[PDB]
Automatic annotation (TrEMBL), chains A, B:
Intracellular or extracellular location(s): Cytoplasm
Native organism: Aquifex aeolicus (strain VF5)
Protein known as: Transcriptional regulator (NtrC family)
Lineage of the organism: Bacteria, Pseudomonadati, Aquificota, Aquificia, Aquificales
Residues of the full protein shown: 393 to 438 of 439
Amino acid sequence: HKSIKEIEKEEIIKVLKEVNFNKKLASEILGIPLRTLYKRLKEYGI
Amino acid sequence: HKSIKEIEKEEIIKVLKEVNFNKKLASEILGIPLRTLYKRLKEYGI
């Protein structure tokens, strides 16, 4: 079973893959500010 | 002698102290986007 955290992580990484890790584009697709994407990736250790 | 990197680091940390580590306010005072402040602090290990 996937937690909320896992569901978010999976979508963030999926979108980053789709746009070849262009963070700006990924943030726009995810609907989150670029600063928030940075924060998530730091937390994930990625 | 202080490098460009050191001068930037010292000002970032000085401003953060002045506003009690309110990052949003610090970013506005420093003239940099909040995402950039996040990136700098991560690089500094702070």
